[PDB]
């Protein structure tokens, strides 16, 4: 495949294909993430059986639709894994974790190229808008001290650690954006947190986001200027979860249609270590 450089021509007068959507159903898998509050309100032992029997009539085979359960958006943010061919996430909204859904969908909806960071030795910087520092763990307290040309902290002291400028405080997953082109010093608690210098590639398109409730409050881009609403940012107003699950299983043919299984990554992870 490695000769990507040769262009493909094609023609504007050739015939359309014969609707390769039913053959997409047979040779694919589908994992829909649901919070544990769903499985509390569901009140069934064999509701995966009921739903999978309903997925059978949509064109899927039996052994294709799996479900995976997470506790909340904070615990899913620790190490989110995308296991199968088409992933959709069902996330319940509240106004508190307003940023913890924006940065979670920032991690989930894009392909990230992450590299490790040894903050105890080296001084790191960000090259352009594309990279961020994405840090995950059970508790991340990130304190960033900016330096100058002479390796001296501006408005701070390099030696003392209490004069630092904290960016995050006791957070499961953080996406820090700092000033590009300035060497910085870190106080990430490495016992419970790993921070990674990580560039943003193109978006991952096997996973869609279903904000169950609330308002249209989500962004990918960390600039204030652009707050894009992509084709797989979608939202549902809820009263019971059964309307939500029946809504998902009814409109499978529309939800896959805004996704692409070509963006499978061979690993369930989300960060592409050591390129």
């Amino acid at each position: 495949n490695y000769g990507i450089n040769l262009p493909i021509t094609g023609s504007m007068d050739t015939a359309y294909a014969n609707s390769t959507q039913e053959e997409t159903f047979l040779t694919s898998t589908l994992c829909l993430y649901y919070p544990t509050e769903a499985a509390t309100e569901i009140n069934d032992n064999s509701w995966k059986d009921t739903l999978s029997q309903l997925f059978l009539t949509k064109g899927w085979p039996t052994g294709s639709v799996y479900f995976k359960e997470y506790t909340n958006i904070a615990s899913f943010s620790v190490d989110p894994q995308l296991y199968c061919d088409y992933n959709v996430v069902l996330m319940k909204y509240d106004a508190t974790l307003q940023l913890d859904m924006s940065e979670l969908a920032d991690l989930i909806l894009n392909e990230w190229l992450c590299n490790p960071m040894d903050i105890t030795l080296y001084y790191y910087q960000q090259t352009d808008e594309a990279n961020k520092w994405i840090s995950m763990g059970s508790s991340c307290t990130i304190k960033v001290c900016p330096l100058n040309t002479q390796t001296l902290g501006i408005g701070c002291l390099t030696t003392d650690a209490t004069t630092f400028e904290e960016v995050a405080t006791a957070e499961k997953l953080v996406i820090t954006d700092v000033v590009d082109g300035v060497n910085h010093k870190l106080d990430v608690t490495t016992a419970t947190c790993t921070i990674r210098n990580c560039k943003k590639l193109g978006p991952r398109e096997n996973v869609a986001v279903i904000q169950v409730g609330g308002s249209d409050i989500l962004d990918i881009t960390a600039d204030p200027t652009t707050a894009p609403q992509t084709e797989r940012m979608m939202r549902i107003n809820w009263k019971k979860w059964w309307q939500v699950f029946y809504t998902v299983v009814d409109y499978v043919d529309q939800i896959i249609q805004v996704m692409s299984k070509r963006s499978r990554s061979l690993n369930s992870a989300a960060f592409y270590y050591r390129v």
């Binding site: 193109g202 652009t226 894009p228």
Partner: protein, 132 residues
């Protein structure tokens, strides 16, 4: 024959090309370095591009002198040839395309097909002198 006969650098309107058999258009798209706020919202640095940059050219040969026979918007000789071949329900022979497809005739314009086309266009010009 691979040699640059005529070249034109950023000149529009009517141009002239004295002798050629290949036309090479080399245009480029430059991102505008100064943009008003109505333009800067069109082209973000991120991925969702709802407005796509597109740069075009149009090249229309108004009149040309060719050593071989062709068809054009002035004569009706190809129309006379196709009218005679379609009026009398003529089978497809060895040289000309089925139905006298000019796209398939100029796609593979062999010298034997060139000789047949010139002969039949000359006879069509003769009949167009007599028969209106």
């Amino acid at each position: 024959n691979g040699q640059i006969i005529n070249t034109y650098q950023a000149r529009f309107g009517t141009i002239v090309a004295r002798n050629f058999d290949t036309i090479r258009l080399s245009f480029q798209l430059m991102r505008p370095p100064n943009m008003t706020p109505a333009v800067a919202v069109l082209f973000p640095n991120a991925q969702p591009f709802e407005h796509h940059a597109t740069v075009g050219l149009t090249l229309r040969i108004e009149s040309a002198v060719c050593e071989s026979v062709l068809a054009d918007a002035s004569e009706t000789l190809l129309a006379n040839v196709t009218s005679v071949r379609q009026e009398y329900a003529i089978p497809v022979g060895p040289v000309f395309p089925p139905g006298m497809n000019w796209t398939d005739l100029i796609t593979n314009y062999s010298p034997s097909r060139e000789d047949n086309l010139q002969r039949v266009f000359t006879v069509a010009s003769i009949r167009s002198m007599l028969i209106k």
